[PDB]
Symmetry: none
């Protein structure tokens, strides 16, 4: 079982990395949309 | 096996916290996107 | 920008579903760990 | 943003593969747990 638990641990590390890389990409996208927000605020509201 | 179970239990929980942060970010992005639609509605 | 955000919306939604599947999986793993703990503890106090 | 979204697509693909691989492993672990219980009545 301990062998199998180690296999689980290694897959959890993979999922953890998947989420890390995905979140980093989301932060990039988030900044992009924030810029679009500020642009459209200036254009349409102010 | 006790220690190994603890190892996995700890890692599971840390990953749950990470995923929570991802979910928060998703919420924020969706709110920013909704803000854009709001400008189209309100400007006009 | 329109269809660019459309694609964003599609990806965000796909990710939302994948996150749900991941969190469910993590709870399922935790259940298995909990059961293994029950057996291990039973051995320890025997 | 085009290329960043493509990278997101690739990460979702990898995530989904990894979810499936983990699900498959867990199924096998749960079978072992069932065997533990099968032979647990008499310690």
């Amino acid at each position: 079982m301990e062998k199998k638990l180690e296999e689980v641990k290694q897959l959890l590390f993979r999922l953890e990395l998947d989420i890390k890389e995905t979140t980093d990409l989301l932060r990039n996208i988030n900044k992009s949309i924030d810029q679009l927000d500020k642009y459209n605020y200036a254009m349409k509201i102010s």
